[PDB]
DNA sequence: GCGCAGTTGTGCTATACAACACACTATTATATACACAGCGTGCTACT
DNA sequence: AGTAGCACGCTGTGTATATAATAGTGTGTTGTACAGCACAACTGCGC
């Protein structure tokens, strides 16, 4: 499974496939994709 | 007296949302009413059934307005009345 | 072939003539235009040739 | 003015769509053959025009049976005020 | 403009603009100068659109 | 008759085609010798039925996906022998309820019965034959939130009701006597747990369940109050 | 019949009613359940 | 203490299965009868 976030309560979900799309603990159907864990690099230029 | 001026601004009326939606919603509601009447003729002349949900069709009005504001064509008899907002800058 | 009221014939003909007509030219003056199911007027061969951005 | 319904909005929609609630109001809810035939004939002299309904009401027999024998004695007129009645 | 009594033909009224751009313009001046500018944009669009169609 | 075109590298010939296609250059090239393979890549009954069906699903506000599943279904049945009747009212309701099922949406037999008068039992037979045809051409839970809507109940109430339905089905005992009674009773329990009044007659009316039925379900459900508690 | 002076016109503008034929649904039993709606009886409250 | 009203409980009929009987009755289908330029061409009117 893959980790997501709720729209409002910002709770961590990590719902799996074939769970459709909804938050547990509230009805918001807007799920954020929960930013990547691995490191990202920039040049200050 | 001089020839009347066509461009005198006091003689031009502007139409915002209200008058528009008035026009359009008028002709929608006429179409609705007329449809209910047709359903009554069909069921009474054919003596079948009357049930309010079948008699009233919501998407007539609903999808009608939704459509119009999507296309912005009032009819064409009018076009481009609706335009997606410019968020370029708060001034704009 | 059969069952000809001859009022139906004369109409069915006028139908054919109409289709072929708007096939070659959709915009003939005074006649009804052929409207594609979307409500847009059909683009006839003549429309394809006629204006700027036509083939020519 | 116009009044804005303030409810939880769920109840109003439930009534709108299929509600599992119906009706609750009503608007546009919409003698043997020997004596039978003899009696029917006396009606025919008594009435120059009559119906399979009037005959079935009298004879308490299906209109189909009434229509068969009547074809023999009576004839049908389908045009005029008396239309659909045997003379 | 509403700011002038009727039948006033003085050039201030009929649109002479006295002040140079460096000194700035009084409002009823400014408005006029906007009218002139608009004439200048309009005709320019017309001339351009027509002249090309001559060039063709 | 033949007419199928395949792309092959005459210089490679080693494999069948293994190539890449370049859309920007609009050309297609063998990935091996780097040769260009191609260039200049270019960029009456029914209609009446679907009309009235359209009206019905529309008045029902069902999302287009459901509408179109039912349309598809109905096309398959169509004129077939085995159907042998039903006057076009039964088929439209059947196909609808199918498209609801297949769409994972749920609608009660009563609800559709409110859009159309199908006489009931006749409807069941038609629905079963149609179901058989679909197999030949080869779940209450959803109802629980929908009902809350009708009552406008909080989210926690709804999820509580869901836990309640799963727990009740496992514990068996009356097997449910149709799902509808269980869904409504499950709610009635959950709400009575909480302070929010609907009382009883209001839910029996509103949701069209016999008051006696709700109370009867309530006694047995009350007995198992022990194991139904989520926290 | 001919000519002249209005009007038009035409491109472009970066089905209903009646009759006949064909299909059908009413009824009776049996376990099953499960359901829903009404009717009767009992209890409580008010006069 | 008596009467009326309300609530609860129990009994009856829909839902579903098969299966035969056989009507006439109802529904559907088919057949018959009745009811913005600027310049270009026609046409119309007058001589
Ligand atoms: Zn949430
Ligand atoms: Zn190659």
From Swiss-Prot, chain A:
GO molecular function, one term: DNA binding
Protein name according to UniProt: DNA-directed RNA polymerases I, II, and III subunit RPABC4
ZnF segments: C4-type: 6-26
Biological process terms in GO annotation: nucleolar large rRNA transcription by RNA polymerase I; ribosome biogenesis; RNA-templated transcription; termination of RNA polymerase I transcription; termination of RNA polymerase III transcription; transcription by RNA polymerase I; transcription by RNA polymerase II; transcription by RNA polymerase III
Gene symbol of the encoding locus: RPC10
Family statement: Belongs to the archaeal Rpo12/eukaryotic RPC10 RNA polymerase subunit family.
Species of the source: Saccharomyces cerevisiae (strain ATCC 204508 / S288c)
Other remarks in the entry: Present with 907 molecules/cell in log phase SD medium.
Described purpose of this protein according to its UniProt entry: DNA-dependent RNA polymerases catalyze the transcription of DNA into RNA using the four ribonucleoside triphosphates as substrates. Common component of RNA polymerases I, II and III which synthesize ribosomal RNA precursors, mRNA precursors and many functional non-coding RNAs, and a small RNAs, such as 5S rRNA and tRNAs, respectively. RNA polymerases are composed of mobile elements that move relative to each other. In Pol II, the core element with the central large cleft comprises RPB3, RBP10, RPB11, RPB12 and regions of RPB1 and RPB2 forming the active center.
Residues annotated for Zn(2+) binding in this entry: 6, 9, 23, 26
Compartments where located: Nucleus, Nucleolus; Peroxisome
PTM statement from Swiss-Prot or TrEMBL: The N-terminus is blocked.
Swiss-Prot record, chain C:
Region feature Rudder loop, mapped onto this chain: 26-43
Species lineage: Eukaryota, Fungi, Dikarya, Ascomycota, Saccharomycotina
Source species of the chain: Saccharomyces cerevisiae (strain ATCC 204508 / S288c) (Baker's yeast)
Function according to Swiss-Prot or TrEMBL: DNA-dependent RNA polymerase catalyzes the transcription of DNA into RNA using the four ribonucleoside triphosphates as substrates. Largest and catalytic component of RNA polymerase II which synthesizes mRNA precursors and many functional non-coding RNAs. Forms the polymerase active center together with the second largest subunit. Pol II is the central component of the basal RNA polymerase II transcription machinery. During a transcription cycle, Pol II, general transcription factors and the Mediator complex assemble as the preinitiation complex (PIC) at the promoter.
Free-text domain note: The C-terminal domain (CTD) serves as a platform for assembly of factors that regulate transcription initiation, elongation, termination and mRNA processing.
Listed name of the protein: DNA-directed RNA polymerase II subunit RPB1
Subcellular location: Nucleus
Underlying gene: RPO21
Family assignment from sequence similarity: Belongs to the RNA polymerase beta' chain family.
Curated annotation (Swiss-Prot), chain D:
Subcellular location: Nucleus
Miscellaneous: Present with 520 molecules/cell in log phase SD medium.
Functional description taken from the UniProt entry: TFIIF is a general transcription initiation factor that binds to RNA polymerase II. Its functions include the recruitment of RNA polymerase II to the promoter bound DNA-TBP-TFIIB complex, decreasing the affinity of RNA polymerase II for non-specific DNA, allowing for the subsequent recruitment of TFIIE and TFIIH, and facilitating RNA polymerase II elongation.
Span covered, complete protein: 251 to 350 of 400
Protein name: Transcription initiation factor IIF subunit beta
Family under the similarity heading: Belongs to the TFIIF beta subunit family.
Domain of life: Eukaryota
Subunit structure, as described in the record: TFIIF is composed of three different subunits: TFG1/RAP74, TFG2/RAP30 and TAF14.
UniProtKB/Swiss-Prot annotation, chain F:
SUPFAM superfamilies: Cyclin-like (SSF47954), Zinc beta-ribbon (SSF57783)
The UniProt record lists the keyword Zinc: yes
Localization annotation: Nucleus
Residue numbers binding Zn(2+): 9, 12, 30, 33
Chain ranges of zinc fingers (TFIIB-type): 5-38
Alphabetical list of CDD domains matching this protein: CYCLIN_TFIIB_rpt1
GO cellular component terms, A-Z: nucleus; transcription preinitiation complex
Family the entry assigns: Belongs to the TFIIB family.
Other comments on record: Present with 6750 molecules/cell in log phase SD medium.
Protein name: Transcription initiation factor IIB
